Amino acid sequence: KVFGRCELAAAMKRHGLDNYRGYSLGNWVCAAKFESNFNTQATNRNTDGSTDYGILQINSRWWCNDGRTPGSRNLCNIPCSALLSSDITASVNCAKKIVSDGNGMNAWVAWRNRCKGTDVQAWIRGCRL
Ligand SMILES: [Cl-]
Ligand SMILES: [Cl-]
Ligand SMILES: [Cl-]
Ligand code: NA
C-alpha cells in the first residue's frame, strides 16, 4: 500500500507515535517519506547481505527474521514479511523498540540526513488529526 501523507500521519497517531520518546509526529512522517516513499512494500538490500523492510525500512541485521541474514538477531520477534503489510501495526511496534534503544531516531539514516533539524511540522500541515 502507498499511503497518502495525511493518511499515514493519522495512522501513526492512532498507533501512539505522536511524541513517542519525544519525537513529534512530523518526524515519523518525514522519515517514512524518505525511507520508503510511503510504500509498505519497499525493500532494499544492504552491502552486508541484510535487507531493509517496509515503510520504515527496518533492518534484518537486528530486528526481524528473513531466513537469509546469517548471524543476525530478531529483536522485534517477527518475520520481516510482517513489516510489508498494509496494516502498519507491526512496523510501528518494532519502531518503538528501535527508537527506545538509546540512539533515538538516528537509527534511520534518512531521518538524520533529511529530517533532523528541519521544520518537520510541515509534514503534518493541513491534516485532520
Ligand atoms: Cl510535528
Ligand atoms: Cl536469518
Ligand atoms: Cl532521543
Ligand atoms: Na534477523
Curated annotation (Swiss-Prot):
Its EC number is 3.2.1.17. Substrate binds at residue 101. InterPro entries: Glyco_hydro_22, Glyco_hydro_22_CS, Glyco_hydro_22_lys, Lysozyme-like_dom_sf. It comes from the Eukaryota. Keywords: Allergen, Antimicrobial, Bacteriolytic enzyme, Disulfide bond, Glycosidase, Hydrolase, Secreted, Signal. One of its GO terms (biological process) is defense response to bacterium. Disulfide bonds join 6-127, 30-115, 64-80, 76-94. One of its GO terms (molecular function) is identical protein binding. One of its GO terms (cellular component) is endoplasmic reticulum. In the egg white and polymorphonuclear leukocytes. The keyword Lipid biosynthesis does not apply. The keyword Electron transport does not apply. The active site is at 35, 52. It holds the Pfam family Lys. It is found in: Secreted. Its main location: secreted. Residues 1-129 form the C-type lysozyme domain. Monomer. Lysozyme C is capable of both hydrolysis and transglycosylation; it also shows a slight esterase activity. It acts rapidly on both peptide-substituted and unsubstituted peptidoglycan, and slowly on chitin oligosaccharides. Belongs to the glycosyl hydrolase 22 family. Lysozymes have primarily a bacteriolytic function; those in tissues and body fluids are associated with the monocyte-macrophage system and enhance the activity of immunoagents. Has bacteriolytic activity against M.luteus. This is Lysozyme C. It comes from Gallus gallus.
